[PDB]
């Protein structure tokens, strides 16, 4: 199966710059993984159709409930920090890396 993994963020649209890093990644690479984007609060009912979730920066604080959320299923939940994530939002090797060292 493909690795399916969305990221979320608070709306801002910055969870689209890492979705479009880890696609570009994948597809250069040729690696099975896609990459959504969403806000947070619009993903209760679809977060089980993913394999990895990805906080974006300023959805840090949500991180424990959604690591809660996450137990039924045993679905990967990351967060991460600002300078983190900017740095893979700029680089498709380093955001697929990403993606894979957290769901081995």
Same mark, same amino acid.
Do not use: F, K, W
């Given at each position: 199966k493909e690795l399916k993994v969305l990221v979320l963020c608070? *709306?801002? *649209?910055?969870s689209a710059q890492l979705a479009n890093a880890i696609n570009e990644g994948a597809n250069l690479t040729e690696v099975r993984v896609i990459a959504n984007s969403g806000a947070y609060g619009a993903h209760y009912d679809i977060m *089980?159709?993913?394999?990895l979730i990805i906080l974006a920066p300023q959805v840090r604080s949500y991180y424990r409930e959604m690591k809660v959320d996450a137990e039924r299923l045993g679905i990967q939940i990351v967060a991460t920090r600002g300078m983190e994530y900017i740095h893979l939002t700029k680089s498709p090797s380093k955001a697929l890396q990403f993606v894979l060292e957290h769901y081995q």
């Open positions: 608070a *709306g801002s *649209g910055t *089980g159709v993913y394999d």
